[PDB]
Design a protein around this ligand. Structure first.
Ligand SMILES: Cn1cnc(Cn2c(=O)nc(Nc3cc4cn(C)nc4cc3Cl)n(Cc3cc(F)c(F)cc3F)c2=O)n1
Ligand SMILES: Cn1cnc(Cn2c(=O)nc(Nc3cc4cn(C)nc4cc3Cl)n(Cc3cc(F)c(F)cc3F)c2=O)n1
Lengths: 301, 301
């Protein structure tokens, strides 16, 4: 029993982080086989950071301009290329601890583990979700550029996020491991605004099922609603649309608990309309939306 | 910016977990140097589990009754001893990935990372606190016995918890790595009740400082209170006493934010008396008490 914000064990990823330095600019890189992946922002001097032309900046570089340090051992760069917003540095040594891995891009509403990293040294691990507005509400300080987000399936690490910058609201923006940004952001040191966010409805329902599995049932009721009558109220509360696919994905949880999805939706409608009234669900006083149906099944087996 | 429930990177601990089997009973063990540490409950058959006499059960065992599996490799047991509620199995192979480590016992109110483990295989990592009543609000399923909790300081892993059982309220009880239980619990398969819990006041104040560092200031006020007038109200709300040592420990956070501790206490008194009124602090709608002052400084550098 119990329900926590649970990350994947980070060991397989810790063994891949290195430090990348170009000039006096430094950040974190990801060493897989004989390639190091890192934000291309590393080739910016402090004067290039506001408005870089990255093609210009990189053609002025050679392999010897890149200092890669894997803990103690300096890795010799023997090639460099740029792929969208990530730089690829070929090194003369394959990482002997390279896990089986994939580069996957995730969807808004999906979760992943973040290994926060500073000067190539892992500092902490936490779980988060990609928000509907393509930001993440991370925890990152100066020096965290290049930290990665990932999921693990069996023994395969699916890398899905590489951290780039913090927006003025304190939320975070980055790319997939092919260098393509999540959301309408660009890798310049300029203030950029996140769009309006929404609440991930299917995740809230998944978490309510987790509560029932763990014996929190006070919010349940005998009522039911239709899909469209639910979506009419929820969207007044800045909730995203609940599709039949979302209802379908919630199937297994509905089966294990014996509570129909539209029955759970009637509970959520009342919680939205009435609040939670000095009560908690799984230790929280608000409706938690950063647990996917898969996360719930994973933790509530 | 940002503030999350952040665990330590788990790699150094993942490399130490093994599976221990005695008869048909199986659980997780911790392999450090040439010793495997695990709950002594493993020597119980299903019929011994309710009311074991562990000295009796163990004298009837020999080294060949213990199957230790480090992933693929079977470790040969060459000795066994029992220390309080943990069993020590000497093996013929030192763990080549043994980190620098210590066995430390933690205090109620202190936090640690949990590596949840099943059949010797790490599954997830999360952060939690030792509650004032010496339980932890973990997330554990069947097969998690022997999972460990830890902190990391520089490169040294300080092991502080080994998981044993789940209580009827769904909270969790275990021992330090010397086998001495936290709290008034015993390793028998009988229903045991946790005592009444309290809220960790110094941690709530630390988290309010974290909020101010992250720009959440709506709960601040121009008032101040005395230590004893604060403790009179807080204890009406099942909060633990705030000592001058607690005020002293909060010193650095008070200095970095320029908010005196008893000024922050006046904010907490109002939050307790008035509630939070449809507003959130660092993404939570209740007063979070599982972040220590050190956790805040760690994450809000
Ligand atoms: C508060 N915070 C939260 N997350 C972050 C991540 N982050 C970062 O770590 N570094 C950044 N700028 C750099 C300055 C450097 C100074 N030296 C010596 N080396 C440096 C390297 C970097 Cl990468 N930034 C800002 C930033 C990074 C980008 F990749 C980008 F495209 C635009 C940006 F404005 C940053 O956000 N900090
Ligand atoms: C739901 N939950 C949450 N945490 C836990 C931890 N936990 C556990 O993992 N196993 C336990 N009993 C066993 C049964 C076995 C069956 N086989 C084949 N092997 C087994 C091994 C164990 Cl250890 N228990 C119960 C329990 C474990 C103890 F160590 C103890 F002292 C008293 C107890 F009641 C358990 O709580 N489950």
């Amino acid at each position: 029993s119990g329900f926590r914000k649970m990350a994947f064990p980070s060991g397989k990823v810790e063994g891949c982080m290195v430090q990348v330095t170009c000039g006096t600019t430094t950040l974190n890189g990801l060493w897989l086989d004989d390639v190091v992946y890192c934000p291309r922002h590393v080739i910016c001097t402090s004067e290039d950071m506001l408005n870089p032309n990255y093609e210009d900046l990189l053609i002025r570089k050679s392999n010897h301009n890149f200092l890669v340090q894997a803990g103690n051992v300096q890795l010799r760069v023997i090639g460099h290329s740029m792929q969208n917003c990530v730089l690829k540095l070929r090194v003369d040594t394959a990482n002997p601890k390279t896990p089986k891995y994939k580069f996957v891009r995730i969807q808004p509403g999906q979760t992943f583990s973040v290994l926060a990293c500073y000067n190539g040294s892992p500092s902490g691990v936490y779980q988060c979700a990609m928000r509907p507005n393509f930001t993440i509400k991370g925890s990152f300080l100066n020096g965290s550029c290049g930290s990665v987000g990932f999921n693990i399936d069996y023994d395969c690490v699916s890398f899905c996020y590489m951290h780039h910058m913090e927006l003025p609201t304190g939320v975070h923006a980055g790319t997939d491991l092919e260098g393509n940004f999540y959301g309408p952001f660009v890798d310049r040191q300029t203030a950029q605004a996140a769009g309006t966010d929404t609440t991930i409805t299917v995740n809230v329902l998944a978490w309510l099922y987790a509560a029932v599995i763990n014996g929190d049932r006070w919010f349940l009721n005998r009522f039911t609603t239709t899909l469209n009558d639910f979506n009419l109220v929820a969207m007044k509360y800045n909730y995203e649309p609940l599709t039949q696919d979302h209802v379908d994905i919630l199937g297994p949880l509905s089966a294990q608990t014996g509570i129909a999805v539209l029955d759970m939706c009637a509970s959520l409608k009342e919680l939205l309309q009435n609040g939670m009234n000095g009560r908690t669900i799984l230790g929280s006083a608000l409706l938690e939306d950063e647990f996917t149906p898969f996360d719930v099944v994973r933790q509530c087996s």
